[PDB]
Amino acid sequence: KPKLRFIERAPLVPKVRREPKNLSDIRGPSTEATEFTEGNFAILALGGGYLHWGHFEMMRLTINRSMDPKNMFAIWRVPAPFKPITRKSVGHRMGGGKGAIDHYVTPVKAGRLVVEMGGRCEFEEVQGFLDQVAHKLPFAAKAVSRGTLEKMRKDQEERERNNQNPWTFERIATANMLGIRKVLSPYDLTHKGKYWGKFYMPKRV
Amino acid sequence: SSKNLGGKSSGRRQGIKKMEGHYVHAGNIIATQRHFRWHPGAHVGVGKNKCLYALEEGIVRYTKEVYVPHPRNTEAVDLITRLPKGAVLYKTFVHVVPAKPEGTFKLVAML
Amino acid sequence: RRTPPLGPMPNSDIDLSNLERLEKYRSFDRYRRRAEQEAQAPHWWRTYREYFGRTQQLLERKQAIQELRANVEERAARTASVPLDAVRAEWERTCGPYHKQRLAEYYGLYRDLFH
Amino acid sequence: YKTKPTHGIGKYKHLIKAEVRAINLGTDYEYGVLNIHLTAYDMTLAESYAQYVHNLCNSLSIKVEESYAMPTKTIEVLQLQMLLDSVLTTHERVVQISGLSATFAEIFLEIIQSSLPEGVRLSVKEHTEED
Amino acid sequence: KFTRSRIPEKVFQASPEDHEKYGGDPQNPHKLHIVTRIKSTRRRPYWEKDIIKMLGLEKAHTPQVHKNIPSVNAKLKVVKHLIRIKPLKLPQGLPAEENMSNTCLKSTGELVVQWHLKPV
RNA sequence: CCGAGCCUGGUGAUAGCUGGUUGUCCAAGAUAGAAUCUUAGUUCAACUUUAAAUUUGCCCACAGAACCAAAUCCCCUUGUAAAUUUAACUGUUAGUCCAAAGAGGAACAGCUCUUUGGACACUAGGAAAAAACCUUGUAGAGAGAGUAAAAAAUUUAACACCCAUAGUAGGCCUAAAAGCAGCCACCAAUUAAGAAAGCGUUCAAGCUCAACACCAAAAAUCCCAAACAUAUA
RNA sequence: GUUAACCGUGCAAAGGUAGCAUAAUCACUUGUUCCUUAAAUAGGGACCUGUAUGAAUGGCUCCACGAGGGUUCAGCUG
RNA sequence: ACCUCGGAGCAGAACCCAACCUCCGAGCAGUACAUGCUAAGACUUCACCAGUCAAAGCGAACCUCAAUUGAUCCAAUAACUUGACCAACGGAACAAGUUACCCUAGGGAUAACAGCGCAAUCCUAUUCUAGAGUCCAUAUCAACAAUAGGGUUUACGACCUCGAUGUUGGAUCAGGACAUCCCGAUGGUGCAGCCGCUAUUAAAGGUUCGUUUGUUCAACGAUUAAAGUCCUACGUGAUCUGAGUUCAGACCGGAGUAAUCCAGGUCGGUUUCUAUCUACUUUAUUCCUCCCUGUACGAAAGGACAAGAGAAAUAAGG
RNA sequence: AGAGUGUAGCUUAAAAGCACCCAACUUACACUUAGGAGAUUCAAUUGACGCUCUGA
RNA sequence: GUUAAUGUAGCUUAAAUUAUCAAAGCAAGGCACUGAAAAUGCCUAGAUGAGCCUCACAGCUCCAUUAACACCA
Numbered sequence A: 001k002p003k004l005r006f007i008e009r010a011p012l013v014p015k016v017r018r019e020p021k022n023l024s025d026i027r028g029p030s031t032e033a034t035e036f037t038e039g040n041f042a043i044l045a046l047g048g049g050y051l052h053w054g055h056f057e058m059m060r061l062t063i064n065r066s067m068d069p070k071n072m073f074a075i076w077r078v079p080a081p082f083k084p085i086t087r088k089s090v091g092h093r094m095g096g097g098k099g100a101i102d103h104y105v106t107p108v109k110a111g112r113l114v115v116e117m118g119g120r121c122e123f124e125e126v127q128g129f130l131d132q133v134a135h136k137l138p139f140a141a142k143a144v145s146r147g148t149l150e151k152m153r154k155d156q157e158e159r160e161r162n163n164q165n166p167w168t169f170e171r172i173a174t175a176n177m178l179g180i181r182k183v184l185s186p187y188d189l190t191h192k193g194k195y196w197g198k199f200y201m202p203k204r205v
Numbered sequence B: 001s002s003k004n005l006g007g008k009s010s011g012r013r014q015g016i017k018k019m020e021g022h023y024v025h026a027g028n029i030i031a032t033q034r035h036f037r038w039h040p041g042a043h044v045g046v047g048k049n050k051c052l053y054a055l056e057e058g059i060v061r062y063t064k065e066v067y068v069p070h071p072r073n074t075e076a077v078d079l080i081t082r083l084p085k086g087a088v089l090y091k092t093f094v095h096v097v098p099a100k101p102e103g104t105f106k107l108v109a110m111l
Numbered sequence C: 001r002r003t004p005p006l007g008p009m010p011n012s013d014i015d016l017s018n019l020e021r022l023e024k025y026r027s028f029d030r031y032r033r034r035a036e037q038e039a040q041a042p043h044w045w046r047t048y049r050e051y052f053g054r055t056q057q058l059l060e061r062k063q064a065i066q067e068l069r070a071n072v073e074e075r076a077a078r079t080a081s082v083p084l085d086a087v088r089a090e091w092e093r094t095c096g097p098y099h100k101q102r103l104a105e106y107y108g109l110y111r112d113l114f115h
Numbered sequence D: 001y002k003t004k005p006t007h008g009i010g011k012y013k014h015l016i017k018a019e020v021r022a023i024n025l026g027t028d029y030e031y032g033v034l035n036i037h038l039t040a041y042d043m044t045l046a047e048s049y050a051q052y053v054h055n056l057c058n059s060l061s062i063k064v065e066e067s068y069a070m071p072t073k074t075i076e077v078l079q080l081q082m083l084l085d086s087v088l089t090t091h092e093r094v095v096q097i098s099g100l101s102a103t104f105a106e107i108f109l110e111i112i113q114s115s116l117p118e119g120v121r122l123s124v125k126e127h128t129e130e131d
Numbered sequence E: 001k002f003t004r005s006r007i008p009e010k011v012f013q014a015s016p017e018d019h020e021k022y023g024g025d026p027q028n029p030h031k032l033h034i035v036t037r038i039k040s041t042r043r044r045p046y047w048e049k050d051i052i053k054m055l056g057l058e059k060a061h062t063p064q065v066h067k068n069i070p071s072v073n074a075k076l077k078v079v080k081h082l083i084r085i086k087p088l089k090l091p092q093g094l095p096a097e098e099n100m101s102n103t104c105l106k107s108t109g110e111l112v113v114q115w116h117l118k119p120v
Numbered sequence F: 001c002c003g004a005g006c007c008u009g010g011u012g013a014u015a016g017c018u019g020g021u022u023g024u025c026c027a028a029g030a031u032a033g034a035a036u037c038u039u040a041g042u043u044c045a046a047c048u049u050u051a052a053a054u055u056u057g058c059c060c061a062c063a064g065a066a067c068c069a070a071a072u073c074c075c076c077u078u079g080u081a082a083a084u085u086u087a088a089c090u091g092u093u094a095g096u097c098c099a100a101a102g103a104g105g106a107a108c109a110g111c112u113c114u115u116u117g118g119a120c121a122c123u124a125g126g127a128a129a130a131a132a133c134c135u136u137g138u139a140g141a142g143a144g145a146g147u148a149a150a151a152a153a154u155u156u157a158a159c160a161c162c163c164a165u166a167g168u169a170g171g172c173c174u175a176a177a178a179g180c181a182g183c184c185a186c187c188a189a190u191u192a193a194g195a196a197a198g199c200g201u202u203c204a205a206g207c208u209c210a211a212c213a214c215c216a217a218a219a220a221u222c223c224c225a226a227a228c229a230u231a232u233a
Numbered sequence G: 001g002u003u004a005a006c007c008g009u010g011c012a013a014a015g016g017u018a019g020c021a022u023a024a025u026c027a028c029u030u031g032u033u034c035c036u037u038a039a040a041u042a043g044g045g046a047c048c049u050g051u052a053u054g055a056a057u058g059g060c061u062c063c064a065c066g067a068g069g070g071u072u073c074a075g076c077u078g
Numbered sequence H: 001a002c003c004u005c006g007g008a009g010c011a012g013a014a015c016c017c018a019a020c021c022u023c024c025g026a027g028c029a030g031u032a033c034a035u036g037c038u039a040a041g042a043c044u045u046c047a048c049c050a051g052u053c054a055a056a057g058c059g060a061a062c063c064u065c066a067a068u069u070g071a072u073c074c075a076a077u078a079a080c081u082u083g084a085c086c087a088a089c090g091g092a093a094c095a096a097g098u099u100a101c102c103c104u105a106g107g108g109a110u111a112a113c114a115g116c117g118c119a120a121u122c123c124u125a126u127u128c129u130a131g132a133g134u135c136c137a138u139a140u141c142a143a144c145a146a147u148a149g150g151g152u153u154u155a156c157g158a159c160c161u162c163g164a165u166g167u168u169g170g171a172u173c174a175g176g177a178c179a180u181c182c183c184g185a186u187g188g189u190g191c192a193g194c195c196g197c198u199a200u201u202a203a204a205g206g207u208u209c210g211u212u213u214g215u216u217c218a219a220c221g222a223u224u225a226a227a228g229u230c231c232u233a234c235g236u237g238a239u240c241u242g243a244g245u246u247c248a249g250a251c252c253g254g255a256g257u258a259a260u261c262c263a264g265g266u267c268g269g270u271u272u273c274u275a276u277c278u279a280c281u282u283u284a285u286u287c288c289u290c291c292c293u294g295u296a297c298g299a300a301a302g303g304a305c306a307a308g309a310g311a312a313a314u315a316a317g318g
Numbered sequence I: 001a002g003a004g005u006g007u008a009g010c011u012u013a014a015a016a017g018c019a020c021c022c023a024a025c026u027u028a029c030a031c032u033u034a035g036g037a038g039a040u041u042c043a044a045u046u047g048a049c050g051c052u053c054u055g056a
Numbered sequence J: 001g002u003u004a005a006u007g008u009a010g011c012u013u014a015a016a017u018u019a020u021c022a023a024a025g026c027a028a029g030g031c032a033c034u035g036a037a038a039a040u041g042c043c044u045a046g047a048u049g050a051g052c053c054u055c056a057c058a059g060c061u062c063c064a065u066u067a068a069c070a071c072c073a
Ligand SMILES: [Mg+2]
Pocket: B007, B008, B009
C-alpha cells in the first residue's frame, strides 16, 4: 500500500545482551542495498551515520504529507532500529559497568539507498520534497533518480581515467611508497582514499 | 554495577608446538588442543586432554585425509548417514615420517 | 587474505539448493566404500600417500552354472565342501600366473632381480 | 599462512541438513501435506497396504513423513437387527505424504487404486487432526 | 594495528612505457645495484632499522653494491622508501687486478676503470 | 605546646615516606608479566651490564597450520654478525603523546583500558613559541661545500519578454462551492489559453504561470610581523 | 472496610496516655490563618502528618533572675 | 559491588593480551576397583609453586566430564592416610568500631576551592516547512530534525598547586564583552493612535531606594527613561567585613550497646603582615513642564510625534 | 521406404559394480542379516533381427 | 539515583511444593422483619515474559510497591 509503513521504535523482542559500539558499521562503502529494486527515485547516503526513531518519523511524515498516494508509492530500504545504544544516566563518575539500553539505532553506510520511491511522474516532481528529507538526515545525502545515479557513477568513473596526476591513492598506498602505510589504516587500502571515517568525499579520486 | 563476574581465566597456551617439516623425537608433543583441530595420523598418539604426541623419531607433516569414524562412535555415525551420496568429510591429520631405520644387523663374533 | 583453490574443491558438485531431494547415504558402509575410493585419487592438495607411498569360454561357463545349479539339490545351500585340490589345479592353469606376479612384486624380487 | 588455497576442505555442515500448503503458482498446487487414511475391518490387510504405499513412495522418491495409526473403533453388532451382539472392530491407519506434483498426482493415485485390496478404504485430505 | 606491510607482485611488473622512461630492458638485465640510503632510519620500525644494518647502509649517502638476485631484492623491497637503487653499469669492463687501485664510481653509476685527473 | 607532664636512660627507637649523597675521563644502557594485608613496596621472570664458553642467530620461500581483514607463526636460500649457554650481579618493575585495530564514555576530554609500531625522557634542524608530529643520529677543530624537512589556499544567488476570449453557473456532491472545500471524469468552440500550476473568492470577479502570436558569523586587558597581484625554476 | 466513634484481622512484653507542638525538634516548609510593617524567609497568638514530639532521656505552666538567644515602643545619636 | 577456578567475545587466521568490560558457568555427580607399579621424551597459564601428556617395560585385562578446588607447619593415625566457605581462595595460628580532642610521615601520584580540557546538560544563531497565528508556514511562536557557535549552569576528567593558590555574600573601586534594559538611529508588523512585538545598527553615557533572608536569588513596598545579561582566580580579604560555611563547647530529634555520628536544625567561636621589585599616582547627559492641541489618528475611549520656548536633576570641574 | 543404433534398470564397467525383489527384525521406513533373480538381437569389422525416428 | 525486601481469594494471614481460614459476597435455613450465631458451596493465572525441571515453588527477566541510603571538603 503506497505510503510508508510505521517504523516502530524498539522491536518487540528486546535485546538483552549489550553489544559493543562497533563503528565499523558506519565506515566506508555499503555492500547492503545500493541498488533500485522496483522503484526509480531515492535518497542516496553520501556519508555514514545512525538513524534514530526520530529521523524515521521525520522521514515518514514529511513524505506522506507531500506525496500523492494515487500516483506514488514509497518503500523503506532500511530496517527498523535494531542496534541498541547504551546511555548511562547523567551525573555519574566513570566506572560501574556498561549502562542501560536507552534507544535503538540503525546504522547506514555511505552509498546506501535509504527511501525508494516510484510512480507516475518524472524526477523533478519528487526532487522537491525528497531534498528537504535528505538535508535533514544526520549525514550528507542526495535525492537521486534511476538515471542520475548512473549519471553520477558514469561521472565518477570517467573522473578516474581522466586525471593527469600520475599518483593516485591506490598506487601509493598498496605499493607503500613513502612508508606511507605508517599513517594510514588497513581500511585505507580497499576503501580508497575516498572515505575518511564517517565522511565520504565524492570529489576525491 | 557490573553484574558480570568470573571471566578472569588466563590463556591456555594451546596450539601447534612442532610446525610442519620439523624434526621431532619420539615423545614430543606436536600439538595441544581442545575440540579436535588436528587428528592423529601415522605414528601420532592422543592423550587424555586430546593432545597429539609423536610415537616415532621422525619429521612431522600435515595432510588432508578422508574421515571415516568408528562404527561405535554414535555421535558421528549419524553425521555420516545424513550426508548426500557424493560427500566425504576430509578432516586434517598430523603424520610423522620416521627418519631412522629401526636397526641394523651387525657382526658381533666370528664363530 | 584468501587465495583460490588450485584444483577442484571436493563436495562442490553436490552443493545443490535442493538438499532435501538428494539421494542421501543411510548406512555407514556405503560411505566407507565411497571414501576409500577417494584415497586412491590424484588429490592436488597434500596426501599421506605422497610421503608414505573367449566366445566358447563364456558359452561353456554358461551351461556350467546351469548344470551346477541342479546337483546341489539348493539342498546344499540351506553346507557344501568345495574340494580345493581340483580347484588349485584349475587356479594354477588360469589365474595362477596373474596372482603369482603379485607375490613376486610384494616380496620385491623384480626390484632386486631385474631392476 | 594459516587459511590456504585448500581452505574449507572439511565443511560438514552446508552439506548436511541442519536444525501448511504448497504455494507454487501457475504450475499450481503440487500437493503438500496430505493424509491418506487406510481403513479396514481387518488388521493385517490394512497394515500390508501401508506397507505397500510407503515402499511405493520411496521408490518414486516422493516424500513421506509419518506412518502412524488412528486408534481402533469400538462397535458391536449395531443392534439394528433376539437382538444380535458380536464385536466387529475397525483398524484405521494414517499414511502421510509431503511431496507431490500436479503431473504425478492423478497417476500416483492410480497405482494406489489398481493395487488396493479387499475391503479397505482410502480418504485423501489436508491436515487438521491429532491422535 | 601497524604491521609489516607486504607488496603485491603486480607492483614489480615493469611496463613497456617503464622501459622508455628508464634505460633498462627486461632481456639482459643489470647484474649489480647501487644502493644508497637517502632517508634516516629513525621514526621507522625496528625491522626496517635492522634490514638497513644488514644491507650495510649505516651511513647515509654512501654507495654500496649488492647482487641482483631475488633474495636481496626481497630485503630491498621492505626498505625501498629509504634507499635509491641504481644499476651499476660498467662502461669499460670489470676492474682487473692491475686496475683496482684507481677507479671511481661516477654518479650516474658508471664505474670507470682508468680515472685520471686530466681534461679530455 | 597535657586525649595524658617533664627529665635522663633503653636510643644512632623505627620509618616500604621525604630531603641529602662531594675528583676527572670514556664505554654499554628504556622498563612483556606473575604473586603479594599487595598495587608509594618487595621476590621471581623480562630487560640491561660484565666476564666467559661454544655454534649458529637475525633476515627469511616453496610447502604447511579448523571447524563450528592488516598480518603473525614456521622456514632453506640470501644478506649479514651476532646468538645461545655458563658464571656474578645490580637497577627498572608509580610512564606519556602520535598513527593504527578496538573496548569503556557522549562515536566528550591533554579521558580511561589493552594490542602493534614509532617518538619522547638524547643531542640537532623544522612546524612561531613547543616532549611526543616532521627531518636527522657515533660525537672534535674549520672564517668550506651539497643537502634534508621546511612559507595555506579560497570570494560566491540579476533575469525571460509579451499576452489572455468561450462550453460552463462542470455530470457528481455540497446552503454555496462557477480554476482553486472534495471524488470521478478532464472531452470540447475558435488558430490558440489546463473543467487550471502558484497568489487572490462564503460563492462570484481579479493578478500570474502554462497556450497562441511577437523575436554565514559572535566574548570578555590591546588588532596583531611588516608588507607585496607582473625580469624568466 | 463504613474523615471515620465502629467492625474485620494480624502482631506485640506494651502498642505514645496526659500534656505540648511547624518548636533550639529530619525533611516537605518561606506550611496555614491572625497581629505586627508602606512592604515581615523575622517576631508574637493560634490551627496539627509531631508517621522522626512526649512525661526524673522528665512533660507542662508560672514569680523572680540572666554581660544568655531572638523581637519591639519611645527617646537618642556621624 | 567484588576478590579463587573454567567456557565465549573484545583478542576475526601461532601463542599472548587489560577493563568496577560484555555474557555463561564450577566449589560436583556418575561408572569403575590394575583410579597397579615403574619409565624415554615433552608441554606448562608468561616467574616460582603448582599443574598437564606419554612410548616402552613389569604385572594384568581380553575412565566420562570444562571448571569441579587449598601450600607449609601443625594435628588425628600402629600403619596407610585424613584433616579449613584457611572463599580476603599463593592461605598471618587466634584481633572490631570511633576520633570535629587528634598527632606524625608524606601526596597535587589523590579529593574539596580555583585554573585548564570537553561540551552530555545549558545558552544562541541559522537551515527545514509540520503545526499554531480566523484564512495565511516565515507580523509573531514553533514540533520532528539538521548544521555551526559560545564556554554564564550541573557534570565529567585529575594536567599545575597539599615545604598552603585563603572561601560564600556584602563594602570599596571598578576593567571589559555585547548576545542592548534605558537613551540614539532604522526595517517589518496581525504598526489606526497611545502603547507594544521583532529585527538591523550603537557599548559614548546611565543602570534607584527599602522590609524579611547569612544570602547572590526570589518574594514584596515605593519608584524610575531603565532598575540589562555576563566575564574578570564564582573581579577585588598583604583594602575591609566573618553573618553564613568549616575546628575545639553545647543542646534537640534521629542512627549506634557505647565511643560517637548526621549536606538536619540552633546558640557561641583569635581574620597576621613595617611594601624589595613590577605597575600606578590630575585630559556632559537625562527626565519633566508649557506649546503645537486637545492636533494627526480612531468615529469613539484615548491621544502622539518632529518645530520652538521654559524648568530641572544627576555627573564632571570649580 | 530413409535413419540412429543395440551390455538385465543404468553405466568415457569390461560378463563387473551398483540399483532392484522376498523374508527376519522395525508402527512402519531406514539400517543390518539371511536369501532370490537376471543381459552382450543373431551369422562371417562386416552381413543380417530389435527398437526409437523421418515417411505415405 | 542506588542497594534491601515484598509480591495472593473481595479483603488478610498462611501453607517451604500440591494452596488454607476469616471477614467479603451468594443464597437456604429458629415464622412479625433485620443484626448476631452456626452450616453447604462459592472467592486464589499464587504481581510478570521466557521452560533446565515441575514451578507460589527456582535463579533470572521484569513491573509495581515498601524501608534503608542519597556522604567528607
Ligand atoms: Mg577470556
